[PDB]
Design a protein around this ligand. Sequence first.
Ligand SMILES: [Ca+2]
Ligand SMILES: [Ca+2]
Ligand SMILES: [Ca+2]
Length: 126
Amino acid sequence: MASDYKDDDDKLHLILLPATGNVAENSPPGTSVHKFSVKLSASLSPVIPGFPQIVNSNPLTEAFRVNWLSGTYFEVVTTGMEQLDFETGPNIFDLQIYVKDEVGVTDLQVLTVQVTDVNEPPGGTK
Ligand SMILES: [Ca+2]
Ligand SMILES: [Ca+2]
Ligand SMILES: [Ca+2]
């Protein structure tokens, strides 16, 4: 009926199956965690600034954003409103990302973000 039908073949989909992310704790500011690509639409029309979209996240975590590098290439950037601390406890969170083109294409995916403990500098507060 529909499930048997290859619905994916006759529709546009993102390049690089989603989705994983991993950075060395919150040590690097504004450093991309992972990059994802989108298949070129037949229309190939340009998209407005702020490529769609972050719909949800697994709490408690605030330090991520979407960076549209160009055309159909983008990556998630770390260190936003607040920084992430390993000592807090949580090390992984899933981000529900919604993707929409100008033509009206749609796709929802989950992006896991991992936090890795980073060693403090040899010099610092005594
Ligand atoms: Ca740590
Ligand atoms: Ca630390
Ligand atoms: Ca450490």
